[PDB]
Design a protein around this ligand. Structure first.
Ligand code: ADP
Lengths: 50, 50, 1144
């Protein structure tokens, strides 16, 4: 919902969905580019914590 | 004889003393900061925490 | 003949004196060259030791080593970095028998005790082929180690000895080795099989070094536990050291629990000295040993607490001082010291007079007066002792100014009666040896003054009659000048208390009735008024603090970015990139010039670079990775491929220093190919700039390096084919794409350390490529990192841990106004450190002095701003202390963590924090991110932490970091392709050349089409096309009324835009090429074939010289108070209306 002052609601579940889909898309691209593995290890760590 | 009244002035004293402790730590770091020779006792202390 | 005999006795001392700087090094070189036997120099401290460690090799040729000391503090909580231990024991292996050689140990090490030699001669083996030893000798040494003779060896603890061939199967390795002794010597190192008995490898020197200095196995563990239960008391704790080692694992400082891992008394390393060894002394021991022992004890009862990790008494882990001075009567000893002992036997003072005042300055007219007046009157030979090779040429033309010829010799004995020679070495100070009249002069013997300059103090020279000569009969209300502040009204004398001292003072009233009470003692600062205006005198306000002057109200958006970024992006996506050509063997011969081997990830990064370079597409590749991972040679292989296709490689870096290293790297790597490589910065002269940039158009320089000077709207590459940009997270957006504005389909390759969020997001969203690198070639260190609260003793022990290692400390404060105070605040906190000051705002000569003196270890701790972020060398610096890590960008946090390290030494990094609830939440997220990731390869994911806490910036604007509620990327791509096919719809000229052919009409006034008037950036773009392509005022007005038709009224930015276009029409009509205007006036620059009425322009000049000056032939500076921009527009309008009325 807009807060009547030009911005939106807080709505933390959309924030968490945005965060998780960011990590997921970033990791998908990272596996697409065939990075060396130690990068995608801690990215999978980050997505799991997300 | 084990419980005492602290009235209006004593609590205002305590709140004022808490504010004084915050501003004296601030002005203490400001005084330990150099360039004292051009300093004044007005920019060194700030009326916001009191 | 030499000068002095030596101590050869059981305990004799040999006193030597008259010793100035760096003479002791060539003296002990003499000692080593004259004594058939070892030389062990005892050092007073690490620093001098390390300093002497490159001194002595300058003067002689023998193999010279330190003993690797444990790097830690006494009773510290840190492992000594096993590799160092591996170096430590190794030297300690050959220390019992080493015939010739020089070992420098410090009193920190020499007071330390070592392993009991049972473990070393039993549980370790280094053996080289040039070791003349027999068969049964090694047989009985294996027997004494406890090994078993099996003639078909398979088991740990076995060896074979048949005929001449000996075999061994150790505790350490799973393989036996064949020895083949001949003529009382070792003659094979044959790695043969456990069963098949044929050789795997022919070795010269076998290195079976134990994994620790101490026994580690089970029997050692129960022996240790027996010792601990005898000494300390065991508590039920899963972190207590007894249970911790009982689990088999190890804590950090475990080695400081030394003697429990042997159950023997520990030797003081004197046991490891050879038979007739010669100890040489430096400074004294009789001082430093005392205060080291005092520090040792003070630290011991400082941590003689804490049943979690209790400590042994220092009597086992060290000698006592008296114990040292007893064992120092067991060896013939030399004491070198810096004064004149009078006379006795076993004593000599050798003429080593310090150098006279030889110094250079720019203040005198001929700078080398002292040297030019010294050298003709110095009867002996003269030696020049330059450190570096290229710095040799820094002396080469310098003494050529005094016309004096250096010859390169190697040996100090090479001196003649009178001759001038250069010596390449590592000295620091010179001297005259008056025995042979020899003179050694260091480079640092030239620049003795690291001096600043004073100022102010004007009225202290005004001792005139107005000072009143301290009359003390002054009246009240007298306006009185007090020279530091100004004039007040004197209001009497007053007594005040001052902290247990009552006093009498002169109360003086300044402005806003602020009192000031100078003492009656210092009455001479006080002067009577001189202006004669005693009843008209002003009043100064005290303090002069006008900071309030930082309030508000600056506007922005003078120039739109979004349309132009969309334009350059559409132009790139419209045209096609260059398909490069690759030669196998020509590229392979370039690969041969690389004197290394590519790590496999580095290779495939290089392969992805070339297999994108050679394509019809345009390269746009991030080559992100951690610093020091080998990024540059990727760009080398890229450029070579580019440059052989004749494509004029352009290199961009954001500082002069990085350009300076890059010039060396490029020139040294391209040392065999017909390519000319140069650089440009502010350090280049204009006369060099004016030929380099001109020649760029001609183009025999193919590789050009520089700062922002390339992006200065004058550099014209004749055929640009490769952009390489380094150290990305700078450069805004405009500087980044300002080069691509020149050539739409240029290939761009961007190196970085940690990419900025915008270029990270745009790369990860498929717009640009990404190629990550990891796995550094040399095994570098993850320099342990901490984030702790500010604590005066924590920073103290950090400083101490670094300085008794011997290196230097970067201590960064990043506020120049108080760094002077913070210097002494640190300095009496650590009184034995040496602190100098360095920041970016000094006078640009003392800074270089500070950094070079730092580079020559003349002081230990440097207080600094973030000037060090420019990435200087000197890896001896090994500890960063960021005092207020609250306000520092996370990318350059990683960068500063990259500053320490660069060594096999374990670097450290303390990140001081304020109190956790005081700081910003974002700062806490930053510090949790930096405390999470301490590895190699973690730079990139740390940039993924930089993103997603600040928001990756807007995809079609500036401001690389920020949430900003941008253009959505799917909508971004749609607008992009719409621009693409609308662009290639009918071959529409790129907007950038509509910039170039346009006359310069800059007026410092906001002239654009605002986003509210036109939301669609394609439409605003094509309107920009139509206005700058419009060539008639009729078409300008038609476009204007069409805009009005489409969107209502015409706002002021649109109106100003359109009339500037009108002005451009008559500017190009007359020949008025360069028009700049401002508030103050501006410059009208005409063409060479201009429509200026010359006589009428002279009439303008002679009717108003204040508003018309020809400064140049066609440069007319007009000075007008153009306060209103409407008046500015009408002024310039009516002015060119006058000029067209006078057009010819
Ligand atoms: N494949 C390799 N094998 C051995 N050493 C390498 C290799 N690649 C790089 N190095 C070493 O690492 C350094 C490379 O650093 P460079 O790419 O010049 O800049 P950065 O320090 O930013 O990586 C060089 O000093 C080089 O000696």
């Amino acid at each position: 919902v807009p807060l009547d002052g030009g911005r939106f609601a807080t709505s933390d579940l959309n924030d968490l969905y945005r965060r998780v889909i960011n990590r997921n898309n970033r990791l998908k691209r990272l596996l697409d580019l065939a990075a060396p593995d130690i990068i995608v290890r801690n990215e999978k760590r980050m997505l799991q914590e997300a | 004889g084990n419980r005492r009244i602290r009235s209006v002035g004593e609590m205002a004293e305590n709140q004022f003393r808490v504010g004084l402790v915050r501003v004296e730590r601030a002005v203490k770091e400001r005084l330990s900061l150099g360039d004292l020779d051009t300093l004044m006792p007005q920019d060194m202390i700030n009326a916001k925490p009191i | 003949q030499y000068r002095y005999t030596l101590p050869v006795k059981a305990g004799e001392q040999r006193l030597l004196g008259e010793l100035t700087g760096a003479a002791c090094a060539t003296l002990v070189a003499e000692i080593a060259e004259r004594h058939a036997g070892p030389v062990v120099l005892i050092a007073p401290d690490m620093q001098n030791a390390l300093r002497l460690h490159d001194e002595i090799s300058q003067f002689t040729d023998q193999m010279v080593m330190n003993l690797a000391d444990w790097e830690t503090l006494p009773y510290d909580s840190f492992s000594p970095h096993q590799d160092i231990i591996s170096s430590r024991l190794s030297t300690l292996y050959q220390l019992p028998t080493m015939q010739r050689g020089v070992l420098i140990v410090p009193v920190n090490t020499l007071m330390q005790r070592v392993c009991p030699h049972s473990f070393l001669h039993g549980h370790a083996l280094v053996m080289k082929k040039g070791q003349r030893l027999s068969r049964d000798a090694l047989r009985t040494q294996l027997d004494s180690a406890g090994y078993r003779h099996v003639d078909q060896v398979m088991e740990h603890g076995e060896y074979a000895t048949r005929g001449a061939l000996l075999d061994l199967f150790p505790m350490g390795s799973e393989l036996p080795y064949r020895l083949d002794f001949f003529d009382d010597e070792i003659d094979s190192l044959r790695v043969f099989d456990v069963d098949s008995q044929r050789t795997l490898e022919e070795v010269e020197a076998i290195n079976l070094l134990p994994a620790h200095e101490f026994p580690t196995d089970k029997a050692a563990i129960e022996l240790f536990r027996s010792q601990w239960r005898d000494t300390f008391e065991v508590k039920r704790d899963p972190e207590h050291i007894y249970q911790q080692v009982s689990k088999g694992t190890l804590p950090a400082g475990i080695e400081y629990w030394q003697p429990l891992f042997f159950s023997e008394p520990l030797p003081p390393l004197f046991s490891y000295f050879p038979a007739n060894t010669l100890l040489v002394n430096t400074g004294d021991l009789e001082t430093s040993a005392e205060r080291f022992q005092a520090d040792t004890l003070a630290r011991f009862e400082n941590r003689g607490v804490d049943p979690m990790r209790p400590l042994l008494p220092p009597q086992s882990l060290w000698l006592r001082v008296d114990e040292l001075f007893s064992e120092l009567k067991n060896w013939p000893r030399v004491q070198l010291k810096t004064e004149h002992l009078p006379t006795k036997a076993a004593n000599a003072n050798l003429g080593f007079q310090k150098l006279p005042d030889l110094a250079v300055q720019a203040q005198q007219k001929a700078p080398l007066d002292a040297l030019r007046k010294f050298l003709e009157t110095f009867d002996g030979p003269v030696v020049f002792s330059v450190e570096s090779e290229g710095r040799r040429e820094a002396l080469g033309e310098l003494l050529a100014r005094i016309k004096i010829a250096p010859q390169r010799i190697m040996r100090l004995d090479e001196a003649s009666d009178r001759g001038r020679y250069l010596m390449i070495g590592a000295a620091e100070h010179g001297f005259v040896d008056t025995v042979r009249n020899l003179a050694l002069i260091c480079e640092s013997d030239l620049l003795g003054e690291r001096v600043a300059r004073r100022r102010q103090d004007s009225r202290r020279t005004i001792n005139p009659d107005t000072l009143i000569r301290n009359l003390a009969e002054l009246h009240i209300g007298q306006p009185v000048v007090h020279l530091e502040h100004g004039v007040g009204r004197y209001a009497g004398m007053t007594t005040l208390e001052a902290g247990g001292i009552t006093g009498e003072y002169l109360m003086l009233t300044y402005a806003n009735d602020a009192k000031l009470y100078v003492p009656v003692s210092s009455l001479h600062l006080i002067s009577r008024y001189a202006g004669g205006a005693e009843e008209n005198a002003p009043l100064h306000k005290l303090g002069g603090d006008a900071w309030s002057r930082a309030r508000q109200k600056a506007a922005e958006k003078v120039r739109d970015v979004a349309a132009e970024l969309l334009d350059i992006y559409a132009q790139r996506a419209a045209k096609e990139g260059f398909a490069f050509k690759h030669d196998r063997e020509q590229y392979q011969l370039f690969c041969d010039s690389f004197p290394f081997e590519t790590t496999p990830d580095q290779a495939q990064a290089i392969n992805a670079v070339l297999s994108d370079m050679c394509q019809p597409l345009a390269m746009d590749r991030l080559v992100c990775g951690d610093v020091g991972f080998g990024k540059t040679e990727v760009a080398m292989r890229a450029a070579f491929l580019a440059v052989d296709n004749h494509k004029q490689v352009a290199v961009l870096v954001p500082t002069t220093l990085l350009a300076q290293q890059h010039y060396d790297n490029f020139r040294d790597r391209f040392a065999n190919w017909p390519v000319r490589i140069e650089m440009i910065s502010r350090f280049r002269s204009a006369k060099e700039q004016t030929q380099i940039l001109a020649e760029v158009a001609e183009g025999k320089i193919d590789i050009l390096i520089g700062t922002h000077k390339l992006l200065q709207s004058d550099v014209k590459f004749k055929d640009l084919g490769l952009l390489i940009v380094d150290e990305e997270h700078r450069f805004g957006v405009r500087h980044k794409e300002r080069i691509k504005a020149m050539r739409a389909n240029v290939d761009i390759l961007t190196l970085t350390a940690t990419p900025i969020p915008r270029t990270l997001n745009m790369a990860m969203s498929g717009m640009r490529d990404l190629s990550i690198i990891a796995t550094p070639p040399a095994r570098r260190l993850a320099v342990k990192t901490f984030v702790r609260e500010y604590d005066s003793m924590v920073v103290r022990e950090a400083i101490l841990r670094e300085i008794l290692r011997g290196g230097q400390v970067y201590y960064l404060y990043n506020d120049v106004e108080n760094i002077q105070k913070a210097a002494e605040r640190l300095a009496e906190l650590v009184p034995e450190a040496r602190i100098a000051i360095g920041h970016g705002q000094m006078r640009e000569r003392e800074l270089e002095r500070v950094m070079n003196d730092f580079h020559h270890q003349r002081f230990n701790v440097l207080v600094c701003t973030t000037i060090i972020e420019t990435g200087i060398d000197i890896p001896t610096a090994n500890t960063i202390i960021i005092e207020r890590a609250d306000h520092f960008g996370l990318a350059q946090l990683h960068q500063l963590r990259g500053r320490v390290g660069r060594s096999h030494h374990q670097a450290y990094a303390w990140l001081l924090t304020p109190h956790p609830k005081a700081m910003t939440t974002d700062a806490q997220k930053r510090l949790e991110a930096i405390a999470s990731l301490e590895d190699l390869g973690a730079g990139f994911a740390l940039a993924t932490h930089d993103l997603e806490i600040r928001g990756a910036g807007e995809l079609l604007g500036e401001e690389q970091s920020g949430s900003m509620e941008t253009i959505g990327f799917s909508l971004y791509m749609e607008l992009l392709e719409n621009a693409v096919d609308a662009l290639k719809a009918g071959r529409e000229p790129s907007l950038e050349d509509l910039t170039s052919q346009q006359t310069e009409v800059e007026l410092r006034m906001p002239s654009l089409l605002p986003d509210d008037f036109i939301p669609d950036v394609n439409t605003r773009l094509s309107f920009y096309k139509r206005i700058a392509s419009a060539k008639t005022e009729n078409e300008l007005e038609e476009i204007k009324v069409e805009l009005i038709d489409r969107f209502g009224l015409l706002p002021d930015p649109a109106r100003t835009l359109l009339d500037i276009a009108r002005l451009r029409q008559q500017a190009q009509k007359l020949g008025i090429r360069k028009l700049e205007g401002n508030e103050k006036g501006g410059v009208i620059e005409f063409a060479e074939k201009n429509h200026v009425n010359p006589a009428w322009l002279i009439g303008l000049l002679q009717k108003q010289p204040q508003h018309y000056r020809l400064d140049g032939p066609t440069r007319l500076k007009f000075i007008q108070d153009l306060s209103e921009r409407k008046t500015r527009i009408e002024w310039v309008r009516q002015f060119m209306r006058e000029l067209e009325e006078n057009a010819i």
